[PDB]
């Protein structure tokens, strides 16, 4: 349900995104900070995917910098989002009538980015305390959806999945398929370490990297050292 959305970590896995286009025509595929087509060329860190289900007309509310009921009481993306978005109109599965999809309706103040609020306590809209019983100025937060068929697209159920993946390649874990050639040294060679690209001469090095401390950098802020992924050596790019 939208008010308690799941979240699943992805790690240590060659991840392709070719497969997912094999779906019913996505009602939405936006990608906010990276083009969807070139998603098999990058190595990420800690890809995170978290999912829920909402109503039709509210799908355009899942985007940075918007306001509205879902966006301020149930789920809020931050302003500098960096990830993709999917939604694909499940009405063959989630409608019969169904009444175990829930969503919040009242709250004191808006959420904070990427925060889950799960509590079910009586909302108190007044100055006088409630003793856990509904009444005047004493309501219940949640409400059911009731997805019956033949409500038209506006009120029809909708699955949603959002991917957020931080994009500076700290020690990389998840990235798409690509072969691996034997590395050559002391020759001007096109290289592509884990996601970098460019030409240089890869040599041996004397620097010492801490276990968390993966690629070095220089004054003008350009990569000039790198931990080779398979054989964890330290190289110098010139």
């Amino acid at each position: 349900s939208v008010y308690a959305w799941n979240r699943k970590r992805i790690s240590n896995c060659v991840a392709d995104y070719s497969v997912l286009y094999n779906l019913a025509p996505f009602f939405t595929f936006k990608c906010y900070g990276v083009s969807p087509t070139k998603l098999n060329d990058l190595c990420f860190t800690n890809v995170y995917a978290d999912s829920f289900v909402i109503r039709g007309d509210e799908v355009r509310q899942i985007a940075p910098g918007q306001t509205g009921n879902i966006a301020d009481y149930n789920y809020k993306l931050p302003d500098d989002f960096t990830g993709c978005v999917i939604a694909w109109n499940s009405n063959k599965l989630d409608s019969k009538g169904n009444y175990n999809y829930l969503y919040r309706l009242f709250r004191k103040s808006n959420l904070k980015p990427f925060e889950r609020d799960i509590s079910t306590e009586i909302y108190q809209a007044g100055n006088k305390p409630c003793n856990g019983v509904a009444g005047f100025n004493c309501y219940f937060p949640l409400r059911s959806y009731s997805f019956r068929p033949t409500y038209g697209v506006g009120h029809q159920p909708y699955r949603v999945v959002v991917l957020s993946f931080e994009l500076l390649h700290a020690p990389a874990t998840v990235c798409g398929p690509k072969k691996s050639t034997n590395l050559v040294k002391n020759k001007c060679v096109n290289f592509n370490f884990n996601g970098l690209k460019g030409t240089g001469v890869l040599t041996e090095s004397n620097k010492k990297f801490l276990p968390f401390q993966q690629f070095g950098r220089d004054i003008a802020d350009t990569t000039d050292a790198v931990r080779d992924p398979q054989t964890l050596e330290i190289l110098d790019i010139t």
Partner: antibody, heavy 121, light 107 residues
Framework: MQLVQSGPEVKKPGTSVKVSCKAS????????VQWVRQARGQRLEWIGW????????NYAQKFQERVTITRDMSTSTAYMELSSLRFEDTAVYYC???????????????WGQGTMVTVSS | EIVLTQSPGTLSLSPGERATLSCRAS???????LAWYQQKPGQAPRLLIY???SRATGIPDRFSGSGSGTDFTLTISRLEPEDFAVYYC?????????FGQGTKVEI
């Protein structure tokens, strides 16, 4: 801060009537609206109340097969329908809601001007 | 069903005097919800003392209200010629929410 009600209207017995309550000047997404009928020179009588956002209703036992209190967020109004009118239903119908900005006012201190309906032939 | 018996029926002070009313109840009602109202003839009513002790906004300090449990009173300090109306007492603690009978204050 005010409620504006519909206008006077006379019906024949057996029909049904629909009354409406405007809302303007405050935050309506939290409040509740109740309906009170008063005949001429008599006491006040209760009918039922509705919470706006949730839509839940509650009714008096006597008014159990004749009232459908529904609202509409879009235009910010609350409606009431009375069915199978009889001679005893001729009175003045009021509409009240707490003042509610950030917090509600713990008491119905906004009262509409009241509308009249005469069941005659 | 809560039944409220507002007594006395009619009270007849001269202006400048001290007035009292009553809302004796059948069972007990939470003091959280009980309100007095003032109904001028030909008007909608208005809210005087909500919550059984607190005055509503924009109301002269003459009106007090008090009491809990099953007895609640409203006292007007001095009677000026615009306080002559009919006063109702309404509980909305538990369903149904029911009113009083009225109490006409005259000259």
């Amino acid at each position: 801060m005010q409620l504006v009600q519909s206008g006077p209207e006379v019906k024949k017995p057996g029909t049904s009537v629909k009354v409406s309550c405007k809302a303007s000047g405050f935050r309506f997404s939290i409040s509740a609206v109740q309906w009170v009928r008063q005949a001429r020179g008599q006491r006040l009588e209760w009918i039922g109340w509705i919470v706006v956002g949730s839509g839940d209703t509650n009714y008096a036992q006597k008014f159990q097969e004749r009232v459908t209190i529904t609202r509409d967020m879009s235009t910010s109004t609350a409606y009431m329908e009375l069915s199978s009118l009889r001679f005893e239903d001729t009175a003045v119908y009021y509409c009240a809601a707490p003042y509610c900005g950030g917090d509600c006012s713990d008491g119905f201190d906004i009262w509409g001007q009241g509308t009249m309906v005469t069941v005659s032939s | 069903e809560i039944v409220l018996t507002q007594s006395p029926g009619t009270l007849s002070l001269s202006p400048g005097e001290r007035a009292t009313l009553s809302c004796r109840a059948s069972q007990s009602v939470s003091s959280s919800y009980l309100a007095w109202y003032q109904q001028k003839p030909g008007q909608a009513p208005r809210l005087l003392i909500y919550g059984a002790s607190s005055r509503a906004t924009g109301i002269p300090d003459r009106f007090s209200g008090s009491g809990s449990g099953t007895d609640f009173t409203l006292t007007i300090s001095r009677l000026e010629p615009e306080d002559f109306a009919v006063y109702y007492c309404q509980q909305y603690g538990n369903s149904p929410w029911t009113f009083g009978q009225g109490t006409k204050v005259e000259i």
